[PDB]
């Protein structure tokens, strides 16, 4: 889109409509006449724009009014309420900009925010830019979170986030113009190679994919329409329904063979019924002719009766002879009808073992997308975030993604090697207890006005707790943690001295022998300037290949590359790296998913802050003190980076509105 129009769409906002969030802060306007709304909506879109064409400099309010035109600049309390709402929610002035008015000499309020994962720094940049004092507690010796960039020598390769899922309304678009990010386009051609090491026939490759999507769509219509959603008392997983669709389809190839082979016995037993009338005329003809010959034996002259016995036997045999040609005429239409029914037989199989094994790979691609076996995804809700896809081709960062958190961490107070342990939140404030990871012996106490927990959903899930909440998190939160899904996928990085793959393909598949191994090393990526290949390990294989040493994996890896490109063309890798995200201390998994029995409405329970009870009985219900960010908190954008960054912007807006007031609301 184009103009103050595309501004609103690039900020994920309906250009012609006021949102639930703006109704909150401008309930006068949304309640008011439709004219005033359009002057708001234009100011909102005009501001959003101004921020977006130049996002390396702050957008002061004074700067906004000046560039804005009449009649829309006639009102300046409105232009202030708009600009102040935007800046507070990260729609303008977020990320790494240059300040115009530098920071207040004296700060206000204290937040301790746990984890410098990307959602983490997202808030700390915003909380700090609102003149708060932010300190940042990170258990690693690095700032990335699940954004992890391997770098040895010239080689660069992401074992965590890799792909910008398209700049069409992506906040990550804003960061790219702000940060030096080399954004490489990803070309969508993916050649599947079966286990042998040779390519799938271009006709098979379209027949399987097209089938796989029709089976997917089936579960959708199975789910949202036929309402097949509980079976035997449990919720249906996409895995189950995907299978139930196939048995209704392996049933149908057989309902159609039975119907066709039963139409052959329909007419094979009309031919039988016909050839019986025809053998029984051949024989009524045999005897008549016999009788008619013996009637010509009487030599003329003959009395008239014995003349009729020749003519009658002649009329009788020409009549019974006429019937038989009708019955070998009818046998004619059947003999070719029967050779054509048998000649166009229905589908002999539903899917072959060669066919299903390629169907597998499309399920591995689903298991990558979702970091879990399809047996665990919720059938109804797994794709519930679909509506918010970004438009545009996907990309990758050729100098590595880490380059982004690292950028987002400049100017910020970050304590590394600091494993939070207990969160203590009370009506009067918060203390957070942290050890040093290196010595586990230095203990730290951090007191603060509120705590922002960007603790990955797997950490939060961990039994026994890696972090103790004091007081315990309310049941409605902990149940939302149990119900949710934190899943697994891993990455094998392969690092060679020379480019032996096809340089002009970014990514290609490998097709799995079993269903069980459908996850195992099922997809490869060539992305970086250096000879680098990169293998996904999703599915059930994800969690399994963690119990198997690096070499066995890089073995199975080179095994695949050999079959596919020829033993001789596959050198040894100079450097190799397997990820173990399910075993990583401060991850416990890869990213979240909508587990069966979960909804996206758990993603929203996840983000409701915690208000501690009254300290003194009968004291006024306090301020909320414990806030949650992270990719597992943002319903409309789960399990991405941009979704995490977005959540940190959210809370930082929420934390400021609670502790610095919201002056834009009268």
């Amino acid at each position: 889109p184009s103009g103050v129009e595309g501004a609103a769409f690039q900020s994920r906002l309906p250009h012609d409509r006021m949102t639930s969030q703006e109704a909150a802060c401008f309930p006068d306007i949304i309640s008011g006449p439709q004219q005033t709304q359009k002057v708001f909506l234009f100011i909102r879109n005009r501001t959003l724009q101004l921020w977006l064409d130049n996002p390396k400099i702050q957008l002061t309010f004074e700067a906004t009014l000046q560039q804005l035109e009449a009649p829309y600049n006639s009102d300046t309390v409105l232009v202030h309420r708009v600009h102040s709402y935007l800046e507070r929610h990260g729609l303008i002035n977020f990320g790494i900009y240059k300040r115009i008015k530098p920071l207040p000499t004296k700060k206000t309020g204290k937040v301790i925010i746990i984890g410098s994962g990307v959602s983490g720094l997202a808030a700390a940049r915003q909380l700090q830019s609102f003149g708060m004092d932010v300190t940042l507690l990170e258990a690693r010796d690095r700032v990335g979170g699940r954004v992890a960039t391997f770098r040895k020598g010239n080689y660069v390769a992401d074992l965590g986030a890799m792909v910008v899922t398209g700049l069409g309304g992506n906040p990550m678009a804003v960061v790219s113009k702000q940060v030096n990010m080399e954004l490489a386009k990803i070309k969508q051609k993916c050649p599947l190679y079966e286990a042998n090491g040779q390519a799938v026939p271009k006709e098979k490759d379209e027949m399987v994919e097209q089938e796989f999507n029709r089976l997917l769509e089936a579960t959708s219509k199975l789910s949202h329409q036929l309402d097949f959603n509980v079976l035997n008392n449990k919720p249906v997983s996409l895995g189950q329904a995907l299978e139930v669709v196939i048995q209704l389809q392996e049933k149908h190839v057989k309902d159609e063979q039975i119907e066709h082979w039963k139409k052959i016995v329909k007419t094979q037993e009309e031919l039988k019924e016909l050839l019986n009338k025809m053998v029984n005329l051949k024989e009524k003809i045999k005897e008549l002719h016999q009788q008619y010959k013996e009637a010509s034996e009487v030599k003329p002259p003959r009395d008239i009766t014995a003349e009729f016995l020749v003519k009658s036997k002649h009329r009788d045999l020409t009549a019974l002879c006429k019937e038989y040609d009708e019955l070998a005429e009818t046998q004619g239409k059947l003999e070719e009808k029967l050779q054509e029914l048998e000649a166009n037989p229905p589908s002999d199989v539903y899917l072959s073992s060669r066919d299903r094994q390629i169907l597998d790979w499309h399920f591995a691609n689903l298991e990558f997308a979702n970091a879990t076996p399809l047996s665990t995804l919720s059938l109804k809700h797994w794709d519930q975030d679909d509506d918010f896809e970004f438009t545009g081709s996907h990309l990758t960062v050729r100098n590595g993604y880490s380059c982004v958190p690292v950028a987002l961490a400049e100017g910020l107070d970050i304590k590394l090697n600091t494993a939070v342990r207990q969160v203590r939140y009370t009506a009067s404030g918060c203390e957070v207890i942290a050890v040093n990871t290196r010595s586990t012996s230095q203990t730290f106490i951090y007191k603060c006005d509120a705590v922002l927990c960007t603790l990955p959903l797997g950490v939060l899930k961990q039994q026994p707790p890696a972090v103790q909440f004091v007081p315990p998190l309310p049941e409605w939160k902990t149940s939302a943690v149990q119900r949710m899904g934190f899943g697994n996928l891993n990455k094998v990085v392969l690092c060679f001295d020379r480019v032996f793959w096809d340089p002009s393909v970014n990514l290609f598949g490998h097709v799995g022998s079993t269903t069980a191994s459908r996850g195992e090393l099922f997809l490869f990526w060539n992305l970086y300037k250096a000879p680098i290949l990169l293998a996904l390990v999703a599915g059930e294989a994800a969690g399994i290949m963690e119990n198997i040493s690096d070499d066995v994996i890089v073995g199975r890896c080179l095994a695949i590359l050999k079959g596919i490109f020829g033993s001789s063309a596959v050198p040894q890798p100079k450097e190799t790296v397997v990820s173990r995200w399910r075993a990583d201390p401060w991850a416990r998994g890869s990213y979240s998913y909508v587990a069966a029995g979960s909804s996206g409405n758990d993603y929203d329970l996840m983000a409701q802050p915690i208000t501690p009870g009254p300290s003194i009985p009968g004291a006024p219900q306090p301020i909320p003190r414990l806030f949650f960010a992270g990719e597992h908190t943002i319903r409309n954008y789960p399990a991405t980076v941009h979704g995490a960054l977005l959540s940190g912007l959210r809370e930082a807006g929420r934390i400021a509105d609670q502790f610095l007031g919201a002056m834009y609301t009268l």
Binding site: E217, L222, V245, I258, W261, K272, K282, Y292
Partner: protein
């Protein structure tokens, strides 16, 4: 895109754990069923096909060309009266027995000679039988 799911067929595969592996087995053993009474009748029919070897060819009789007549020679007066005693009202068949009268003077032949040849007396003699 493009899938045919009726509720009917769903529950017969979801009812229990093996109700999928069940429902497919009787289809296969009903196709094993149906594949072999095709063998049966395809080879019952193959035997009925060979018993009809030679067709009816040694048994067809040449066609008799005779231009149909008007006047009745005394012979096919009688040929008629015995066709009617044996062929009833099939004015076709009577005409090829006589062979020299078309179907209409056959029709005629009844009424103009009804008194003389007792054709009603011949006709209910036909009905007993």
């Amino acid at each position: 895109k493009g899938m045919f799911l009726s509720q009917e067929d769903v529950e017969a595969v979801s009812a229990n754990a093996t109700a999928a592996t069940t429902v497919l087995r009787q289809l296969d053993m009903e196709l094993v069923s149906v594949k072999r009474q095709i063998q049966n009748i395809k080879q019952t029919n193959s035997a009925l096909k060979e018993k009809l070897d030679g067709g009816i060819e040694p048994y067809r009789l040449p066609e008799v060309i005779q231009k149909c007549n008007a006047r009745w020679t005394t012979e096919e007066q009688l040929l008629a009266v015995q066709a009617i005693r044996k062929y009833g009202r099939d004015f076709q068949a009577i005409s090829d027995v006589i062979g020299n009268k078309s179907v209409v003077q056959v029709k005629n032949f009844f009424v103009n000679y009804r008194r003389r040849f007792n054709i009603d007396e011949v006709l209910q003699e036909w009905e007993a039988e």
